[PDB]
Amino acid sequence: MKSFYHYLLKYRHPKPKDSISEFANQAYEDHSFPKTSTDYHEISSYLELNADYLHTMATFDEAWDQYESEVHGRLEHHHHHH
């Protein structure tokens, strides 16, 4: 794994467009983000803990799917025989 915050740092999206993009800029301002702790359940509640992220829960879930896909996926390609 690699600090979800840092992973997100790669998507600073200097020009928000997609749901994940707008979220990235927002998270950048989250100086309190649990950089030293990445857990779906723990962080999930962190979002619901504030209506600010409540209106974009679908984005976080989607982001996670991408995150794990890059880490939990690695060079273990299977479905795509390319």
Swiss-Prot record:
Secretion signal, residue range per the UniProt entry: none
Highest taxon in the source lineage: Bacteria
Cross-referenced NCBIfam families: PRK13672.1
Family membership: Belongs to the UPF0346 family.
HAMAP family per the UniProt record, alphabetical: UPF0346
Protein name: UPF0346 protein YozE
Gene designation: yozE
